[PDB]
């Protein structure tokens, strides 16, 4: 909170990252640009990030674009951020993503570089009300982005930006692919549409088309019963209701049923609860820790980047706790199939 705490960090020979608490000075051979007011996080409650995949992908495009322009090839590109600690965490998050994804840096190396100036980044909070019981750091986000690359969760060579932005809007179904070709999360569908104003309650019909074309063969409902399962099954969808207390954690019986349904579905699975964030995100994170052996923090990070707001309150503790157990379940699983 003082232009004394200003800091410049080198990313590449031409790219620089700056945290300025004042007016960026200019220069004829330095180009300054900020995304503090360009790629903003749409918060639920006290959460302030991280930014979703779309914005991450947009940022990577802006960097590549700026490094390619003939008008600035002889200039240093400086990505600056201001005095808002939450904006700093996001801008730092984006540079980190760029190093991991396009540069070939490791999560640890990108993190080293980001804290070289001794900058003290505040860690990402959850979307619950009141005190946070768990925090995900920039390093936790870098490992997640890294593994998403290795396992095919992220591919900026094929990522469809307009598709991602179209379907996250409430008026189009508020949905997100968590794992491409395998897991989608969406807002609970209400029996009988109401796509008209103040509301954006979707009936199962605006999902059936998209679902079929992307091979969704299964549907799990964690929400309470707002529609008759029939409306989805009647279209060839296998449906399941693993109901359990809203905002609460799943019993192991439920976690095992979920993993069972999933481990056996024949295509992609669409999961939803009421907001398609908390309960939904919690169970999908479960499948990922067991099958990709990622930490609770890396998983929660990946899931929130795909669908901001996922995993809330006591849900985070649950994942953190169940981690060791899901890691081993997957261990045994992988070997049984061998």
Kindly report the number of other CB atoms within 10 A of residue 198's CB atom.
Answer: 5
Nearest to 65 by CA among 57, 164, 36, 154: 57
Q: How many residues does the chain have?
A: 338
Residue span(s) of the chain under CATH 3.90.190.10 come to 1-149, 170-338
Q: Where are the alpha helices (DSSP H) in the chain?
A: 53-68, 85-101, 107-114, 138-150, 161-168, 205-213, 230-233, 252-264, 278-292, 296-306, 314-336
Contact between 140 and 301 under an 8 Å Cβ cutoff? The reply is yes
Largest Cα separation within the chain, whole Å, is 66
Measured CA distances, 22 to 3, 19, 210, 213 (Å): 5, 9, 48, 51
Specify the DSSP class assigned to residue 100.
H
Q: What whole-number distance in Å separates Cα of residue 277 and Cα of residue 304?
A: 9
Kindly report the number of other CB atoms within 10 A of residue 238's CB atom.
Answer: 16
Place of tokens 């994804």: 101
Q: What's the topology of domain 170-338?
A: 3.90.190
Q: What whole-number distance in Å separates Cα of residue 171 and Cα of residue 78?
A: 37
Phi/psi region, residue 16 (left: phi>0; alpha: psi -120 to 50; beta: rest), is beta
273 is an active site residue: yes
Beta bridge partner(s), residue 136:
124
Torsion of CA 312, 304, 324, 249, to 10 degrees: 30
Catalytic residue among 16, 273, 286, 306: 273
Q: How was this structure obtained?
A: X-ray
CATH number of 1-149: 3.90.190.10
Structure resolution, Å: 2.5
Contact between 44 and 127 under an 8 Å Cβ cutoff? The reply is yes
Q: What whole-number distance in Å separates Cα of residue 39 and Cα of residue 54?
A: 9
Q: What whole-number distance in Å separates Cα of residue 92 and Cα of residue 85?
A: 10
């Amino acid at each position: 909170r003082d232009p004394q705490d200003d800091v410049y960090l080198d990313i590449t020979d031409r790219l620089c990252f700056a945290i300025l608490y004042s007016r960026p000075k200019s220069a004829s051979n330095v180009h300054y640009f900020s995304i503090d007011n360009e790629l903003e996080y749409e918060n639920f409650y006290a959460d302030f990030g991280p930014l979703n995949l779309a914005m991450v992908y947009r940022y990577c495009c802006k960097i590549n674009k700026k490094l390619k322009s003939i008008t600035m090839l002889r200039k240093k590109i400086v990505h600056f951020t201001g005095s808002d600690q939450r904006k700093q965490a996001n801008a730092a998050f984006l540079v980190g993503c760029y190093m991991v994804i396009y540069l070939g840096r490791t999560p640890e190396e990108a993190y080293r570089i980001l804290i070289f100036g001794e900058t003290s980044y505040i860690p990402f909070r959850d979307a619950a009300y009141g005190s946070c019981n768990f925090y995900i750091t920039l390093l936790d986000c870098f490992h997640a982005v890294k593994k998403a690359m290795q396992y095919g969760f992220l591919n900026f060579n094929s990522f469809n930006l307009d598709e991602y932005e179209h379907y996250e809007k409430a008026e189009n179904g508020d949905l997100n692919w968590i794992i491409p070709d395998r897991f989608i999360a969406f807002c609970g569908p209400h029996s009988r549409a109401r796509l008209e104003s103040g509301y954006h309650q979707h009936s199962p019909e605006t999902y059936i088309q998209y679902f079929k074309n992307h091979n969704v063969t299964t549907i799990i409902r964690l929400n309470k019963r707002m529609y008759d399962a029939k409306r989805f099954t009647d279209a060839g969808f296998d449906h399941h209701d693993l109901f359990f207390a809203d905002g609460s954690t799943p019993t192991d019986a439920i976690v095992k049923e979920f993993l069972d349904i999933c481990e056996n579905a024949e295509g992609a699975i669409a999961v939803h609860c009421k907001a398609g964030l908390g309960r939904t995100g919690t169970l999908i994170a479960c499948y990922i820790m067991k099958h990709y052996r990622m930490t609770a923090a890396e998983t929660i990070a990946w899931v929130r980047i795909c669908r901001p707001g996922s995993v809330i309150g006591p849900q985070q503790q649950f994942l953190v706790m169940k981690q060791t157990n899901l890691w081993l379940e997957g261990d045994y699983f992988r070997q049984k199939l061998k």
